Amino acid sequence: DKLPYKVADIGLAAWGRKALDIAENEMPGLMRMRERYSASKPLKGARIAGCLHMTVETAVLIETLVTLGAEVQWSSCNIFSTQNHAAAAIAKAGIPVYAWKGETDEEYLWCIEQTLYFKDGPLNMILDDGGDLTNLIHTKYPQLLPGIRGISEETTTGVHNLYKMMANGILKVPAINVNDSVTKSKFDNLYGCRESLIDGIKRATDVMIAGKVAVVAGYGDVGKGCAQALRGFGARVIITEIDPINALQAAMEGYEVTTMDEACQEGNIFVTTTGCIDIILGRHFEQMKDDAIVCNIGHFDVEIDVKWLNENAVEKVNIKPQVDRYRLKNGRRIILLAEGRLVNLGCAMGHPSFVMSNSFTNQVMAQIELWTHPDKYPVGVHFLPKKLDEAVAEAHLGKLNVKLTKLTEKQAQYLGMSCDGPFKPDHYRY
Amino acid sequence: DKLPYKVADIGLAAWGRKALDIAENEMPGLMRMRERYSASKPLKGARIAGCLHMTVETAVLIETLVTLGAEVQWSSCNIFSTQNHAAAAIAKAGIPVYAWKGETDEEYLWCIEQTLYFKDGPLNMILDDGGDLTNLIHTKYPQLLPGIRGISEETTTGVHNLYKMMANGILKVPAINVNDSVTKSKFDNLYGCRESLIDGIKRATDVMIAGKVAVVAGYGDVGKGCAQALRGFGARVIITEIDPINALQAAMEGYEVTTMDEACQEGNIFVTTTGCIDIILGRHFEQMKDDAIVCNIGHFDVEIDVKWLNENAVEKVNIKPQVDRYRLKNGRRIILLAEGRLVNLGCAMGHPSFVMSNSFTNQVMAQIELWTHPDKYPVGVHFLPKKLDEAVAEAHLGKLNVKLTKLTEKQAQYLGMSCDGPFKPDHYRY
Amino acid sequence: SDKLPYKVADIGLAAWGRKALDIAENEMPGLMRMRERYSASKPLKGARIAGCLHMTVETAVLIETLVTLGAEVQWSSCNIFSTQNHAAAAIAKAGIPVYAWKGETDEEYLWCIEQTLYFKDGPLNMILDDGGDLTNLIHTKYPQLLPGIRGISEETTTGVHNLYKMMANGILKVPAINVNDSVTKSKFDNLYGCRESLIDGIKRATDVMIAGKVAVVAGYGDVGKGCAQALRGFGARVIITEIDPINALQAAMEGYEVTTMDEACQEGNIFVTTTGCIDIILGRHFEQMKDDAIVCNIGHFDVEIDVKWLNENAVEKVNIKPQVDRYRLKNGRRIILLAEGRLVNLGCAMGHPSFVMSNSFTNQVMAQIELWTHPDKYPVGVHFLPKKLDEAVAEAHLGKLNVKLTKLTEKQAQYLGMSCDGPFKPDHYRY
Amino acid sequence: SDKLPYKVADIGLAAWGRKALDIAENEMPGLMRMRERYSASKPLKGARIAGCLHMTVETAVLIETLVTLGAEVQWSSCNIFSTQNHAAAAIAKAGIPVYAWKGETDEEYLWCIEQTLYFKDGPLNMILDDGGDLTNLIHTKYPQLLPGIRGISEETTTGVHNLYKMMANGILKVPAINVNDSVTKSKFDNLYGCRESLIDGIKRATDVMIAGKVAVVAGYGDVGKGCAQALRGFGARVIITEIDPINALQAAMEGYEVTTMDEACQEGNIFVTTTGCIDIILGRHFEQMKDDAIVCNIGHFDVEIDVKWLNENAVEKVNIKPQVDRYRLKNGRRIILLAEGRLVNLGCAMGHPSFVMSNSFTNQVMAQIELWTHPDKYPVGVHFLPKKLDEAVAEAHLGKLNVKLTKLTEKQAQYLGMSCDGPFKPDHYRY
Numbered sequence A, B: 001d002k003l004p005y006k007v008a009d010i011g012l013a014a015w016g017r018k019a020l021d022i023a024e025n026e027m028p029g030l031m032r033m034r035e036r037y038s039a040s041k042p043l044k045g046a047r048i049a050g051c052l053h054m055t056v057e058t059a060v061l062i063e064t065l066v067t068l069g070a071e072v073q074w075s076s077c078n079i080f081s082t083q084n085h086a087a088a089a090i091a092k093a094g095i096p097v098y099a100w101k102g103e104t105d106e107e108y109l110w111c112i113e114q115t116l117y118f119k120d121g122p123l124n125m126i127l128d129d130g131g132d133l134t135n136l137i138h139t140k141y142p143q144l145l146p147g148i149r150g151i152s153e154e155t156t157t158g159v160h161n162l163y164k165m166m167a168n169g170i171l172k173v174p175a176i177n178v179n180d181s182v183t184k185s186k187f188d189n190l191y192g193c194r195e196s197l198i199d200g201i202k203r204a205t206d207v208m209i210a211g212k213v214a215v216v217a218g219y220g221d222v223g224k225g226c227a228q229a230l231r232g233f234g235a236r237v238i239i240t241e242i243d244p245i246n247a248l249q250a251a252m253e254g255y256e257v258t259t260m261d262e263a264c265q266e267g268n269i270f271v272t273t274t275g276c277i278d279i280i281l282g283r284h285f286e287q288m289k290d291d292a293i294v295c296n297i298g299h300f301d302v303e304i305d306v307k308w309l310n311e312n313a314v315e316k317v318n319i320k321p322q323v324d325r326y327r328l329k330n331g332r333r334i335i336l337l338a339e340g341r342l343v344n345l346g347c348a349m350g351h352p353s354f355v356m357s358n359s360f361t362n363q364v365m366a367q368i369e370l371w372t373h374p375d376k377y378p379v380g381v382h383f384l385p386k387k388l389d390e391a392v393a394e395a396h397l398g399k400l401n402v403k404l405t406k407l408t409e410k411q412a413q414y415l416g417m418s419c420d421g422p423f424k425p426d427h428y429r430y
Numbered sequence C, D: 001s002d003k004l005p006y007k008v009a010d011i012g013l014a015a016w017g018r019k020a021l022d023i024a025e026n027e028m029p030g031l032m033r034m035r036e037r038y039s040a041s042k043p044l045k046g047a048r049i050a051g052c053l054h055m056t057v058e059t060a061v062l063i064e065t066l067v068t069l070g071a072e073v074q075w076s077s078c079n080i081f082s083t084q085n086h087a088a089a090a091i092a093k094a095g096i097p098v099y100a101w102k103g104e105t106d107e108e109y110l111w112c113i114e115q116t117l118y119f120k121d122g123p124l125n126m127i128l129d130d131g132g133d134l135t136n137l138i139h140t141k142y143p144q145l146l147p148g149i150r151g152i153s154e155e156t157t158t159g160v161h162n163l164y165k166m167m168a169n170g171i172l173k174v175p176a177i178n179v180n181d182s183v184t185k186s187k188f189d190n191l192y193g194c195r196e197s198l199i200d201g202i203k204r205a206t207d208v209m210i211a212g213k214v215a216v217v218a219g220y221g222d223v224g225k226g227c228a229q230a231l232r233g234f235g236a237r238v239i240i241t242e243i244d245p246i247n248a249l250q251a252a253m254e255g256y257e258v259t260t261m262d263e264a265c266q267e268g269n270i271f272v273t274t275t276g277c278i279d280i281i282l283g284r285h286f287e288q289m290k291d292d293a294i295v296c297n298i299g300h301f302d303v304e305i306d307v308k309w310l311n312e313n314a315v316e317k318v319n320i321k322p323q324v325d326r327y328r329l330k331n332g333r334r335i336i337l338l339a340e341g342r343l344v345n346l347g348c349a350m351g352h353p354s355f356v357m358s359n360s361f362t363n364q365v366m367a368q369i370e371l372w373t374h375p376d377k378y379p380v381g382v383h384f385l386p387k388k389l390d391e392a393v394a395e396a397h398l399g400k401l402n403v404k405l406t407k408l409t410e411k412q413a414q415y416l417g418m419s420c421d422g423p424f425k426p427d428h429y430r431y
């Protein structure tokens, strides 16, 4: 057969709505999209296979896609990031969901698969976060490929692979790079983490940030957010980078920039925002100070060599779900969070509802683009139009009661731009 | 008879230790006190009645008092601030505890009472936080009074009443003002809140701070912490004050200072750090923007007229424990947290372990002072000696790896002070 | 021949000029790195560079760097108030034609530029511009020297804006490089630079306390962001105006109240225009400001503040000191205008600190080398330096700040699919 | 009679002097409030005030305020470099004996103070001091004028420190008020003031970029806290030294690395001493600093930096500009010393902004009125102004910043057990 869905406890449905209900009032974006397309049903006929953290926010997105008329089946893009009551709320809504906090690698893979086939055929669209879905299809379901009209990726690591794939003649379906949409990378990634990272750490450890030395590997949008968040509370943030520019920026902002080999001997807290392997190794673990807290916030759990801890620790006491305290041979201890998996979602609730409205609004627009205007996106990866990007941002000004200035006719000409149309060059970096 | 204690679930004992175990490694202060007095047992014979938030930190304190040899019976100073696993851990330790998250006003009062009498007589000491215990005895057990050797108060509201009582010839036992001990008011109150306030709000609402207008009533140590914490995340903090100095300080720090009547029409988040009644009234509730989040962090729940909400709201949907969303007659909604009770403890875990080591170290010193040197404290309220106060702070430097400078002989003379003894005048304000 | 070998306020300042350059050079590891790498090869040999960029100490180090690389150079400032005389003199004394001095007149300004167009062996080969005045003058009054010019190198946002406008209207006739939008320029000079120079200009001109006041900053671009942060850094309540949703949203996300000038004009004690356009602060605004509100601009051209309305409607105009005039409007209240609407950091102070400027200028030198040594690589139009060169600029200043960079391991470089040396990010990366 | 009616650098600056005072007065609602409340009553009538406080624009507004209240006044600066000449002149031209000018010599310094001791109708009745030099000079060289003096009014931390030392050693012979430790002074002037003036002094003297550098700040008291925050505000990595656990812990809690000068001397690019004592930066330290490290002090007395070791061990001493000398040690590296170790904000800039100074000085005027009008209320010893007056000072500057204060309701005032008007906090409150 096939289960109509699978969640931890459908009973949480009630509380699920509670949360969604409130999150919707924080997401003027998605809500704006709904009241503008609920009638036209632009996504009619679309069979969207989603593989993005099953959280309250995500649920508002999921229902938005539905209100626009697209069949939808969903699974999380991480085994710990699912929020059960939100998962349940959606299941109860009659939408196939396959996620629950605490999946196993097998169950993870199992869920994605359950979303591939619909009652009337295979997926038409892919709304991915990390590239796992799009990667699975290209590698295990190449047959469904010519049946898919477009890919819509949301995070940096996912988009990174999309470019790699296209670059290697492997990308077989048009995809839109939502992450690098201004109102996403420069808000979600930055502002989002600035608030969710500490959240995850706190809920998991309740340790005081102030007065401690935190080490943050990477100074990209996510690094910048985490770093600022930490010192905001009184921690002395030390930063590592491989890129001169990012590195110089850190130093210009007042952070000491060094190598992990050095900083591993000072940090009381470690956060990897890098997008790559081998950031914190045994060499590092062994020199850390007693009870140093190690966690990652990159998409994939590959930056912290957790296995070395399981394989070299004299003990592994588990304090609570997603929190294990190791005792190395030297006698000192180390607190590892969410087993190296992105801590904000694993140990907290991820990003706040508001900033997520931005990410997801871009996400919905992307889906509408690929589905309603296929002939406008050749196989490859594209960006949403700047004018749409500005729109996303404009949509959240009212909620924050921001009064925008309207460029006068006289001024618009001087500047040589529409008092409405695009306000900046494609290369503008905001 | 008399129950040996009363907690939500003794089963949490295991996890309780987990937490205490880790919190102890963050509290070099209390731990320093233990390894210095565990032998001498300076508190031998003392029968301490404690009435302070039953949290993990508190538990480390409780056991510290015990290691010093004082019989102890405990209850929380607030019905929502108790942390059950920590409560349990202590119960299982054979220490009478009477607290659990979610007590009722009656149960609250019931618990305190259960700590008054010990197996060998009434309390010798009072370790209070808020003045409820000391107030109860002076008003309902004046008979036990001449049996008590000293009071040790920890928070601003408690200490405020101590001065009021002494000033009205009602204070009948020597008390020490721990709150106004430098390393307490200027750290716990300030730094503590800076990290715990957002914690409580987040866990309770997961709302984004950035881009919103937060209103903070009061700019004292607690106000300063909350305000800084909020803008730290990107909120536009508006402040109210009745004191010119505090007011001027705010403005000097860049915050707009106004009256609640004005700010009530702008805030998306409201936090009362005042120590008094009638801060946010119906007048205010009615003008707030949709879904404004209202919470208090003052000791007593008297700053927000919650009753007006229960009495004038068209609805009261309860989202989750300690979170109720009202819908006024005007149609807009209001999210009230912990029913007006101090949000950091009610909706989170309160202050981080580290900063609390400071507060509590002063607390232990106070107890030792009153109990071992009664003849040194006449009826009235006193401060710990500055040299002891400096000690508290010194005790936490190693943990943060701070290398202090030792005033040279030549310099100590120039400055006219002991290279060891007090480094500043009693009036120094740090 | 009559042509003056140069023209500065006082050649006597030459001594002190060196003093300053001497110290600035030790803050500009970039330019200094360029010198010890090309002083021999003389890559700019044969180039006749006509520079039109603020004649400041920093600029002087650049000027000599170009020379060390072997390019004849003639210079003038791109603003009548931004020249630093001792730096101007040092260069004159060095035998390099300079035509600038603090306090030029519109005519003198134009006069200076012209004096740099022709060299002892013919017209300019290159244009190093800041603002587009030089490149604009040639295209409009010397179109025939045009086919003699090999490349344009622009440095500021307003200049680059016109370059795109010109190309877009088939008017751009020489290859130009957009230095401003080079990552290590726009995201450092514009941002970090102002963050430190704006307050400088205001302070030296007024010595007013920032803390406790309401400052209004029009625009939240790289320059706006810098100014805003600088102001609240000192305790001022920064209010921001914007026409762009994104920039606007960012401000709000950073905690600044975003409104319209019409509203904020009634609250500000300090006003700073970082916009790049006309009509930002008008009479409507001036009339509602609070007593002694301080108004200043930091955009390249003095067109954002309607200064003329003040000269034409003020009951008084007392001049406190050079570049500082205090007006008294008919309503009785007063208004303090700085540098007559001209970019305050340079007009009332010394502009950006030496260090961050090393970045800007290093890009500038690289640009010149590119256009001059590899013409066939730049068609008529505006281009960006290669990201790898851009990263280089930044890398060059890491040693001075003692930053230890991490070297991507072989194993890692592959996972990431990038050279442990080559470009570390996509062309669209926004840092 | 020979006695000069005053002595300043150039009386000609009088005009510009007014310009500045005129503007500073509109930033000092405090002093101005005091004037319109006592100009009539002339509460200071008969008082012969001998002032020894930095002769700056702000000070001038104070000086005239004292006069408007009817007190004869004679003045000198409490530092040889802090005098602002045009402000000095304005006052001289006003017919008030001033003896100060930027760049005095130790002898001239002492000479000036002396010229203020005697008035046309006898010796001083009052002492308004900043640093204790005046009060110290009298007690040690003019003990007989002592029983003629009614009260001392001290303003800075170092001065007040000696007052307590003197009283403690039975040497203090006249009632004194500790203005510095008046809440609205130490927690504003000291903190906020430096937060803005320190960078000012450094910038005007060196124009170096703060961002990306490592600054070392010795001491984390009100002045340390201000300096530290100011520096990182611009992007510098602030390292702090302290001898006090509490201050030390606070730094760490605020995110600053706290160490010993011996360690930090090898890292700092900028050094600022906010300590109040001797031997902070020695030869040991100078020798390990990085090339061109900038060393400066902001403590009252120039005793924290062993300048003499530099004059005595440097291979060179090139003087860049007034108050700026660049040394070259034997190791070849250089060191930039500012104002010769003397408080940099005043020595290399204009000191604190007008606004925050209104606070300090308002307390100062109140102090003078107290000692002079209510002698019998101040026994020999050092006292604090009443908290209610202190709150008043602060309240007086709320209007200017447009702060709307909340009025405690009757119902509330009782709950809190305090006057909706009277003192709002305990004497021990630390704000």
Ligand SMILES: NC(=O)c1ccc[n+]([C@@H]2O[C@H](COP(=O)([O-])OP(=O)(O)OC[C@H]3O[C@@H](n4cnc5c(N)ncnc54)[C@H](O)[C@@H]3O)[C@@H](O)[C@H]2O)c1
Residues within 6 Å of the ligand: A155, A156, A157, A158, A188, A189, A192, A193, A217, A218, A219, A220, A221, A222, A223, A240, A241, A242, A243, A246, A273, A274, A275, A276, A278, A279, A297, A298, A299, A300, A342, A344, A345, A351, C406, C408, C412, C424
């Ligand atoms: N958890 C969340 O809520 C969330 C939000 C968005 C993105 N992310 C993830 O964050 C990661 C990257 O951040 P961005 O901010 O997304 O991208 P970047 O900003 O593209 O990310 C990594 C940065 O680290 C640096 N870096 C790379 N390898 C390094 C190494 N070995 N050592 C030190 N520094 C190194 C790079 O130069 C780069 O600036 C991705 O994994 C992305 O999916 C997480």
Ligand SMILES: NC(=O)c1ccc[n+]([C@@H]2O[C@H](COP(=O)([O-])OP(=O)(O)OC[C@H]3O[C@@H](n4cnc5c(N)ncnc54)[C@H](O)[C@@H]3O)[C@@H](O)[C@H]2O)c1
Residues within 6 Å of the ligand: B155, B156, B157, B158, B188, B189, B192, B193, B217, B218, B219, B220, B221, B222, B223, B240, B241, B242, B243, B246, B273, B274, B275, B276, B278, B279, B297, B298, B299, B300, B342, B344, B345, B351, D406, D408, D412, D424
């Ligand atoms: N929840 C916690 O973790 C924690 C920590 C310490 C103290 N507290 C509590 O915080 C409160 C006070 O803070 P402090 O910081 O303790 O004391 P303050 O700093 O003594 O507290 C209140 C401040 O608010 C101002 N104020 C008083 N009434 C006001 C009114 N009606 N409107 C506007 N402003 C008003 C005062 O001028 C004062 O500066 C007490 O209730 C104390 O018990 C809570």
Ligand SMILES: NC(=O)c1ccc[n+]([C@@H]2O[C@H](COP(=O)([O-])OP(=O)(O)OC[C@H]3O[C@@H](n4cnc5c(N)ncnc54)[C@H](O)[C@@H]3O)[C@@H](O)[C@H]2O)c1
Residues within 6 Å of the ligand: A405, A407, A411, A423, C156, C157, C158, C159, C189, C190, C193, C194, C218, C219, C220, C221, C222, C223, C224, C241, C242, C243, C244, C247, C274, C275, C276, C277, C279, C280, C298, C299, C300, C301, C343, C345, C346, C352
């Ligand atoms: N003085 C200096 O040291 C220096 C350094 C670099 C750039 N600049 C100048 O700064 C200006 C622009 O800054 P950037 O930061 O260069 O560019 P942006 O960041 O491209 O500059 C202007 C910003 O203001 C906004 N804006 C435009 N018109 C507006 C109006 N009428 N009202 C309100 N907001 C408006 C735009 O949306 C934009 O974000 C240019 O004039 C450039 O030459 C000066």
Ligand SMILES: NC(=O)c1ccc[n+]([C@@H]2O[C@H](COP(=O)([O-])OP(=O)(O)OC[C@H]3O[C@@H](n4cnc5c(N)ncnc54)[C@H](O)[C@@H]3O)[C@@H](O)[C@H]2O)c1
Residues within 6 Å of the ligand: B405, B407, B411, B423, D156, D157, D158, D159, D189, D190, D193, D194, D218, D219, D220, D221, D222, D223, D224, D241, D242, D243, D244, D247, D274, D275, D276, D277, D279, D280, D298, D299, D300, D301, D343, D345, D346, D352
């Ligand atoms: N220049 C100005 O505008 C101004 C304004 C006010 C005060 N001041 C001066 O600032 C100095 C002190 O500051 P405060 O802020 O006035 O006083 P504090 O705050 O009383 O000052 C010094 C601080 O440094 C620490 N300290 C003392 N000796 C030290 C040593 N050898 N090494 C490291 N740290 C040491 C102390 O513990 C103390 O916290 C005095 O000289 C005072 O006159 C200058």
Ligand SMILES: Nc1ncnc2c1ncn2[C@@H]1C=C[C@H](O)[C@H]1O
Residues within 6 Å of the ligand: A053, A055, A056, A057, A058, A129, A154, A155, A156, A188, A192, A345, A349, A350, A351, A352, A356, A359
């Ligand atoms: N609350 C939340 N719901 C859904 N996705 C979230 C989230 N918080 C963070 N994320 C995402 C995780 C990685 C991304 O790039 C970001 O979109």
Ligand SMILES: Nc1ncnc2c1ncn2[C@@H]1C=C[C@H](O)[C@H]1O
Residues within 6 Å of the ligand: B053, B055, B056, B057, B058, B129, B154, B155, B156, B188, B192, B345, B349, B350, B351, B352, B356, B359
């Ligand atoms: N985690 C915690 N444990 C115990 N008391 C706490 C706490 N967080 C805050 N508090 C207290 C609540 C009010 C105080 O003054 C402070 O000591």
Ligand SMILES: Nc1ncnc2c1ncn2[C@@H]1C=C[C@H](O)[C@H]1O
Residues within 6 Å of the ligand: C053, C054, C056, C057, C058, C059, C130, C155, C156, C157, C189, C193, C346, C350, C351, C352, C353, C357, C360
């Ligand atoms: N000291 C200085 N020398 C030269 N140009 C400067 C400067 N400070 C700022 N500028 C420039 C003025 C406008 C630019 O974009 C910026 O590079």
Ligand SMILES: Nc1ncnc2c1ncn2[C@@H]1C=C[C@H](O)[C@H]1O
Residues within 6 Å of the ligand: D053, D054, D056, D057, D058, D059, D130, D155, D156, D157, D189, D193, D346, D350, D351, D352, D353, D357, D360
């Ligand atoms: N502009 C100024 N005028 C007078 N005194 C000033 C000043 N700036 C700073 N100071 C003082 C110098 C030391 C003090 O404590 C402080 O009040």
